[PDB]
Design a protein around this ligand. Structure first.
Ligand SMILES: *[C@@H]1O[C@H](CO)[C@@H](O)[C@H](O)[C@H]1NC(C)=O
Ligand SMILES: *[C@@H]1O[C@H](CO)[C@@H](O)[C@H](O)[C@H]1NC(C)=O
Ligand SMILES: *[C@@H]1O[C@H](CO)[C@@H](O)[C@H](O)[C@H]1NC(C)=O
Ligand SMILES: *[C@@H]1O[C@H](CO)[C@@H](O)[C@H](O)[C@H]1NC(C)=O
Ligand code: NA
Lengths: 152, 306
């Protein structure tokens, strides 16, 4: 491959897992046969900052060609899923909207938007709400820490 | 103009004889208006009288308490939207304080402090916005929340120094006041621990700081062979720069294989393709880096004229 890419499962530190509702990524709690609804991710090692703290990554939905991306919506950094052409994606130089700086401390992961520094991938306190981005990860408004498990 | 119709795919399994609440599950985006609730295939809305066992209040559907016989579908009618919702209510298994069908699986890596979370407590808050205090059990035996081995904060249980023996089925119990009457609430969580995410450095097997005679104008490939975890990354640099992906003469291909025997000693192979040896490449070494959160190894090949 022209990009190093790994299958994983990602869950937040409130034990919520991701799934699709309409066409949006939400976070919640699944039981029994509903665990089928869980989305796995393909995590690619893309180019960006060269640091001992951060590894730039893009996050795709396993086998659906949907990428997590940070875009301005009404003057506010917003997480949106983007359909990509499998013919070109994933690649080493992903556009900056797809790029997250993965930061790992103590088995927990934060994903900072490359495009929007100081803004972090996050989920709400309540179940079943869309995944989002926030620039206030130090107040316990949103959840901005995650665990991951590589499944390849 | 025609009512739109959606069928919700989460089936939430709750306890018989416990209070429960269901919100009509719109995304923010598909909000907007009067929310009525209906039972089964009635086109007559549910009781709005809070005294009745099943009723509508604050656009939510309340079971006060639920019964196994309530299991079935319900519609919430929020232009129009009408969502079929199916719910299941279950008795505990015999001699148990829960039913395995209601299990929420949760997992933490060994060796840290980590949290379990009692789910779907959102709607049991008391003004001023507090949850009732939760008691926590493992396999139906009480836990001491002494802030040394376990802590209870709001909806969370903090398990301190997570280890393998913490595995088991945990229940969180609360008592909620609704119309001056008290109702029990439990959720059950199957707690699974994962192997220690354990801090080690990648080993670069090849190259090993060596020279290589090559002809000017020709082509070559160099292999960086790294022993490590699949999650480590192995990549080349030249003259202080990553290999640019639009670079017209340098390219990388990344391959990997999982070692079944030892997941920590898998292999990464990054092949650098030099489609034409240019004279500049003889001035600086090609360096393979092998990287993860705890550190970096580096080893190089220096091209020389024959
Ligand atoms: C939890 O309970 C279920 C059924 O009673 C059982 O399959 C499972 O082995 C239990 N899990 C743990 C981790 O103890
Ligand atoms: C990579 O290194 C290991 C040495 O332990 C070896 O088993 C494997 O053959 C090497 N592969 C290549 C392609 O260099
Ligand atoms: C290495 O890159 C530097 C910095 O951009 C550049 O000025 C120099 O020409 C390069 N060295 C060689 C031999 O190309
Ligand atoms: C090989 O080369 C690298 C890059 O200069 C150096 O960091 C490393 O220590 C060298 N390894 C050995 C065993 O000399
Ligand atoms: Na329960």
């Amino acid at each position: 491959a022209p990009v190093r890419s790994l299958n994983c499962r990602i869950w937040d530190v409130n034990q919520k897992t991701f799934y699709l509702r309409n066409n949006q990524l939400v976070a919640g709690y699944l039981q029994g046969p509903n665990v089928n609804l869980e989305e796995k991710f393909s995590m690619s090692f893309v180019q960006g900052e060269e640091s001992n703290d951060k590894i730039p990554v893009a996050l795709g939905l396993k086998e659906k060609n949907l990428y997590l991306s940070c875009v301005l919506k009404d003057d506010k950094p917003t997480l949106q899923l983007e359909s990509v052409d499998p013919k070109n994606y994933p690649k080493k130089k992903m556009e900056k909207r797809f790029v997250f700086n993965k930061i790992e401390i103590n088995n927990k992961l934060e994903f900072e938007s490359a495009q929007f520094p100081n803004w972090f991938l996050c989920t709400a306190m309540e179940a079943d709400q869309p995944v989002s981005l926030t620039n206030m990860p130090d107040e316990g408004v949103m959840v901005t820490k995650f665990y991951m498990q590589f499944v390849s | 103009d025609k009512c739109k119709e959606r069928e919700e795919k989460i089936i939430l399994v709750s306890s018989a004889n416990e209070i429960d609440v269901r919100p009509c599950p719109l995304n923010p985006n598909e909000h907007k208006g009067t929310i009525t609730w209906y039972k089964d295939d009635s086109k007559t809305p549910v009781s709005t009288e809070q005294a009745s066992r099943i009723h509508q209040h604050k656009e939510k559907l309340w079971f006060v308490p639920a019964k196994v016989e309530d299991s079935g579908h319900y519609y919430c009618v929020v232009y129009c939207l009408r969502i079929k919702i199916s719910a299941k209510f279950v008795e505990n298994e015999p001699n148990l304080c829960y039913n395995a069908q209601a299990i929420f699986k949760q997992k933490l890596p060994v060796a840290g402090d980590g949290g379990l979370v009692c789910p779907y407590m959102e709607f049991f808050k008391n003004e001023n916005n507090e949850l009732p205090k939760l008691q926590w059990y493992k396999d139906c035996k009480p836990l001491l929340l002494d802030n040394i081995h376990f802590s209870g904060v709001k909806d969370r249980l903090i398990v301190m120094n997570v280890a393998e023996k913490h595995r088991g089925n945990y229940t969180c119990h609360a008592s909620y006041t609704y119309l001056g009457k008290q109702y029990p609430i439990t959720r059950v969580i199957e707690f699974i621990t994962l192997e220690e995410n354990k801090p080690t450095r990648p080993v670069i097997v090849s190259p090993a700081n060596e020279t290589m005679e090559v002809d000017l104008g020709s082509q070559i490939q160099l292999i960086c062979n790294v022993t490590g975890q699949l999650s480590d990354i192995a990549y080349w640099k030249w003259n202080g720069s990553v290999i640019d992906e639009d670079d017209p003469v340098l390219g990388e291909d990344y391959y990997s294989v999982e070692n079944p025997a030892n997941k920590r000693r898998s292999t990464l192979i990054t092949v650098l393709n030099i489609s034409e040896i240019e004279s500049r490449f003889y001035k600086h070494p090609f360096t393979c880096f092998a990287k993860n959160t705890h550190g970096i190894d580096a080893a190089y090949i220096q091209l020389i004229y024959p």
